[PDB]
Design a protein around this ligand. Structure first.
Ligand SMILES: [Mg+2]
Ligand SMILES: [Mg+2]
Ligand SMILES: [Mg+2]
Ligand SMILES: [Mg+2]
Ligand SMILES: [Mg+2]
Ligand SMILES: [Mg+2]
Ligand SMILES: [Mg+2]
Ligand SMILES: [Mg+2]
Ligand SMILES: [Mg+2]
Ligand SMILES: [Mg+2]
Ligand SMILES: [Mg+2]
Ligand SMILES: [Mg+2]
Ligand SMILES: [Mg+2]
Ligand SMILES: [Mg+2]
Ligand SMILES: [Mg+2]
Ligand SMILES: [Mg+2]
Ligand SMILES: [Mg+2]
Ligand SMILES: [Mg+2]
Ligand SMILES: [Mg+2]
Ligand SMILES: [Mg+2]
Ligand SMILES: [Mg+2]
Ligand SMILES: [Mg+2]
Ligand SMILES: [Mg+2]
Ligand SMILES: [Mg+2]
Ligand SMILES: [Mg+2]
Ligand SMILES: [Mg+2]
Ligand SMILES: [Mg+2]
Ligand SMILES: [Mg+2]
Ligand SMILES: [Mg+2]
Ligand SMILES: [Mg+2]
Ligand SMILES: [Mg+2]
Ligand SMILES: [Mg+2]
Ligand SMILES: [Mg+2]
Ligand SMILES: [Mg+2]
Ligand SMILES: [Mg+2]
Ligand SMILES: [Mg+2]
Ligand SMILES: [Mg+2]
Ligand SMILES: [Mg+2]
Ligand SMILES: [Mg+2]
Ligand SMILES: [Mg+2]
Ligand SMILES: [Mg+2]
Ligand SMILES: [Mg+2]
Ligand SMILES: [Mg+2]
Ligand SMILES: [Mg+2]
Ligand SMILES: [Mg+2]
Ligand SMILES: [Mg+2]
Ligand SMILES: [Mg+2]
Ligand SMILES: [Mg+2]
Ligand SMILES: [Mg+2]
Ligand SMILES: [Mg+2]
Ligand SMILES: [Mg+2]
Ligand SMILES: [Mg+2]
Ligand SMILES: [Mg+2]
Ligand SMILES: [Mg+2]
Ligand SMILES: [Mg+2]
Ligand SMILES: [Mg+2]
Ligand SMILES: [Mg+2]
Ligand SMILES: [Mg+2]
Ligand SMILES: [Mg+2]
Ligand SMILES: [Mg+2]
Ligand SMILES: [Mg+2]
Ligand SMILES: [Mg+2]
Ligand SMILES: [Mg+2]
Ligand SMILES: [Mg+2]
Ligand SMILES: [Mg+2]
Ligand SMILES: [Mg+2]
Ligand SMILES: [Mg+2]
Ligand SMILES: [Mg+2]
Ligand SMILES: [Mg+2]
Ligand SMILES: [Mg+2]
Ligand SMILES: [Mg+2]
Ligand SMILES: [Mg+2]
Ligand SMILES: [Mg+2]
Ligand SMILES: [Mg+2]
Ligand SMILES: [Zn+2]
Lengths: 16, 37, 174, 204, 140
RNA sequence: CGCUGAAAGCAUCUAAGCGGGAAGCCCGCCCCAAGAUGAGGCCUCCCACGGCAGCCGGUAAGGACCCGGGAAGACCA
RNA sequence: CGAUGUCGGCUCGUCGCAUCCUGGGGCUGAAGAAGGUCCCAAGGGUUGGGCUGUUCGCCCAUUAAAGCGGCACGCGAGCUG
């Protein structure tokens, strides 16, 4: 059942 | 068999019996046969 | 109003010997062991067995009656014996004796054969009448019930195996 | 509860009543009894059978003594059959007649480290529509925090085969005593050349 | 003055006829004997109780409806792997387990309690193989 | 669903006792399994070796190493 | 909130039982066959397709049946997107 998404779609980690 | 929390006599021919920890009702009329549950 | 206190006539010549927790009962037709509560006293009088109870608590009153009857039945069994008659009803329906065994033709695609257990005797006087006989009342009534169960009375037709003296109660169809 | 040891030799089919009959041929006889197990001595009943003759040069001393006590020439394999006490000192294919039904035990062919699709007939992943390096992978192995672990017994990749397998209720198609041959209809575990046990069947 | 500590003692073997005794009320006593708490030099960190032989375990007794309703339980670790076996059946199959299981639960958990339990020797039926030990019969 | 049967003179499958009764339960089938430390059993083999429930050394029955391989196998086994 | 990735699908299960089927049963306004209704039962089973991102639902063709729920609306360090 569709509800609010609570995170944005994640991107792979930017290099540290 | 009727199974229900309220078991009662239905006709005067109806007999309340306790049998193996349970309340049944027996009648010569099969419709009236009940066990409590 | 009371069974336990009522005494048991013991005919000549059946014997009754009491042991702690049993009474043995012998007669012309054989013997029977009656297991009996340690708590009742079974008392042997002239031509009379009686049972007495230790108090008037419900359990004792309950064991009392049971006990008299249990012995009284044993007594009758070794003297007169016990029997039950079964009638067969319905067109195809028949009984015949195959040696010591009871063969039943009652509408199945096969006949049903009942072997007598020890102490039980089967007799077919006519072919729609069966007689179960023995000295043990429970055993008799039981084997009787077994045979009847092979084909209970139908609810719509005088058809099936019946106890003698069992009323035919049918209901309508359409 | 008769039984015998044998080697699987291979399959063919025979023609019987205008029918092709798939068969496995087993060399079974002759099996010298080399110890009897009894209730008084051993606590249960069975026969230790031997099979295939061995080079005495290869039989160490504790083994030789065992054979000696039976007056039995040395043999490559010893295996018991349970609840079987034959009259003779020797068991041969003759204990079976065509038409009887048997169970055969073999050691199955060994597949080594096997994937989930070969081992457990798992479905695998898609081959396109975006499947990323998961074409033969098992999928999920669990739930989340409850229960937070994997069931004992969960089907996973691992070794598969080279195990004891018993195929049951096989028809005996022929027996050829002059060559110690038992022809059983169907398939028997293991490779050609592998050891098998042929027992009377427990099916009815 | 420091409290007395016993040097190692020779343990005493004891024999108990379980027949007709009430399972639980026998088990507590067996436990005491195994801990060694009948002994005035009781020391809690050494095994210094008796070895206990019990016979006729199959003839243990139980009150109420427990033969039918008391359920022993075993978990295998596998899905659906909780086996429930009732007293009746346990007596009919491994009768000595009934006493064994009851005494075990009345011993301490830990390395010592486990060791104490090995000192219990329970037999169904009137005989036992510990003749060499000449176990002293105890009424309890 | 019964048999027998009181309390409760009748009746009652129940209070004593006995029966029938499910693809379900226990056994039975197939596989693992004595690290089952509660470490089971049987058959066979070796032997009561030297120097000083311990150590050092040479052996026994046996085992490993190495090698040729294997419908066994990732190495290992 | 110095991060417990969020629908659906796939994969892989596992459990509950208020049972969809299969087994046992009582009552039936149960003649039979077929139903209804309640009780016991969770061992196993519980199909393929059109539409739509759908879950759901409707529909086609079958079926003994085409069960309902829980497992972070089970499962993105397993995939999809
Ligand atoms: Mg990042
Ligand atoms: Mg009402
Ligand atoms: Mg009224
Ligand atoms: Mg009545
Ligand atoms: Mg007299
Ligand atoms: Mg008096
Ligand atoms: Mg043994
Ligand atoms: Mg093998
Ligand atoms: Mg391989
Ligand atoms: Mg795979
Ligand atoms: Mg496979
Ligand atoms: Mg495949
Ligand atoms: Mg697939
Ligand atoms: Mg594929
Ligand atoms: Mg796809
Ligand atoms: Mg991608
Ligand atoms: Mg790819
Ligand atoms: Mg998650
Ligand atoms: Mg957990
Ligand atoms: Mg392997
Ligand atoms: Mg032929
Ligand atoms: Mg091959
Ligand atoms: Mg004491
Ligand atoms: Mg303390
Ligand atoms: Mg045992
Ligand atoms: Mg404890
Ligand atoms: Mg603690
Ligand atoms: Mg009646
Ligand atoms: Mg009666
Ligand atoms: Mg009255
Ligand atoms: Mg009773
Ligand atoms: Mg019963
Ligand atoms: Mg019956
Ligand atoms: Mg079946
Ligand atoms: Mg094995
Ligand atoms: Mg071992
Ligand atoms: Mg083993
Ligand atoms: Mg343990
Ligand atoms: Mg061993
Ligand atoms: Mg090598
Ligand atoms: Mg190699
Ligand atoms: Mg947050
Ligand atoms: Mg953090
Ligand atoms: Mg973080
Ligand atoms: Mg996380
Ligand atoms: Mg589910
Ligand atoms: Mg239910
Ligand atoms: Mg049904
Ligand atoms: Mg009908
Ligand atoms: Mg109608
Ligand atoms: Mg009609
Ligand atoms: Mg119905
Ligand atoms: Mg009902
Ligand atoms: Mg189920
Ligand atoms: Mg299940
Ligand atoms: Mg289900
Ligand atoms: Mg299209
Ligand atoms: Mg679609
Ligand atoms: Mg849809
Ligand atoms: Mg919709
Ligand atoms: Mg149907
Ligand atoms: Mg569908
Ligand atoms: Mg989710
Ligand atoms: Mg919620
Ligand atoms: Mg779900
Ligand atoms: Mg998810
Ligand atoms: Mg992802
Ligand atoms: Mg997802
Ligand atoms: Mg995850
Ligand atoms: Mg993750
Ligand atoms: Mg993950
Ligand atoms: Mg994670
Ligand atoms: Mg994956
Ligand atoms: Mg998008
Ligand atoms: Zn009525």
């Amino acid at each position: 059942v569709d509800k609010g998404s609570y995170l944005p779609r994640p991107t792979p980690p930017r290099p540290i | 068999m009727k199974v229900r929390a309220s078991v009662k006599r239905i006709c005067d021919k109806c007999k309340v019996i306790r049998r193996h920890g349970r309340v049944y009702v027996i009648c010569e009329n099969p419709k009236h046969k009940q066990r409590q549950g | 109003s009371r069974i336990g206190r009522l005494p048991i006539p013991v005919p000549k010549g059946v014997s009754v010997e009491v042991a702690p927790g049993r009474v043995k009962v012998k007669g012309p037709k054989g013997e029977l062991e009656v297991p009996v509560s340690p708590e009742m006293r079974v008392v042997v009088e002239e031509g009379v067995v009686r049972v007495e109870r230790p108090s008037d608590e419900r359990r004792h009153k309950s064991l009392h009656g049971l006990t008299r009857t249990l012995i009284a039945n044993a007594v009758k069994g070794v003297s007169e014996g016990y029997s039950k008659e079964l009638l067969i009803k319905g067109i195809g329906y028949r009984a015949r004796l195959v040696g010591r065994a009871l063969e039943l033709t009652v509408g199945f695609s096969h006949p049903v054969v009942v072997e007598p257990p020890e102490g039980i005797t089967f007799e077919v006087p006519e072919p729609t009448r069966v007689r179960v006989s023995g000295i043990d009342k429970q055993k008799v009534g039981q084997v009787a019930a077994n045979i009847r169960a092979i084909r209970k009375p139908s609810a719509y037709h005088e058809k099936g195996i019946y106890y003698a003296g069992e009323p035919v109660r049918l209901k309508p169809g359409k | 509860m008769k039984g015998i040891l044998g080697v699987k030799v291979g399959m063919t089919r025979i023609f019987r009543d205008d029918r092709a009959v798939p068969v496995t041929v087993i060399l079974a006889g002759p099996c010298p009894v080399v110890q009897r197990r009894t209730p008084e001595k051993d606590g249960y009943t069975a026969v230790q059978l031997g099979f295939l003759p061995q080079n005495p040069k290869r039989v160490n001393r504790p083994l030789k003594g065992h054979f000696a006590k039976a007056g039995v020439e040395p043999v490559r394999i010893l295996r018991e059959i349970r609840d079987f006490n034959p009259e003779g000192d020797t068991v041969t294919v003759e204990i079976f007649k065509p038409g009887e039904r048997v169970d055969v035990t073999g050691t199955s062919k060994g597949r080594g480290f096997a994937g989930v699709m070969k081992r457990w007939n798992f479905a695998g992943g898609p081959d396109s529509h975006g499947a990323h390096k998961i074409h033969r992978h098992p999928g999920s192995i669990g739930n989340r925090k409850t229960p937070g672990r994997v069931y004992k017994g969960k089907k996973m990749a691992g070794h598969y085969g080279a195990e004891r397998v018993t195929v049951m209720n096989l028809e005996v198609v022929d027996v050829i005593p002059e060559e110690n041959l038992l022809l059983v209809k169907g398939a028997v575990p293991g490779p050609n050349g592998g050891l098998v046990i042929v027992r009377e069947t427990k099916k009815a | 003055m420091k409290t007395y500590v016993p040097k190692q003692v020779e343990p005493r073997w004891v024999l108990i006829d379980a027949e007709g005794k009430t399972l639980g009320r026998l088990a507590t006593k067996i436990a005491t004997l195994l801990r060694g708490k009948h002994r005035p030099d009781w020391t809690p960190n050494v095994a210094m109780g008796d070895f206990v032989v019990v016979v006729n375990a199959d003839k243990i007794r139980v009150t109420g409806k427990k033969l039918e309703q008391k359920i022993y339980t075993r978990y295998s670790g596998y899905p659906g792997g909780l086996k429930k076996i009732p007293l009746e059946k346990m007596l009919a199959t491994h009768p000595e387990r009934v006493l064994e299981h009851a005494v075990k639960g009345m011993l301490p958990k830990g390395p010592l309690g486990r060791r104490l339990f090995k000192r219990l020797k329970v037999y169904a039926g009137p005989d036992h193989p510990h003749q060499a030990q000449r176990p002293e019969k105890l009424e309890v």
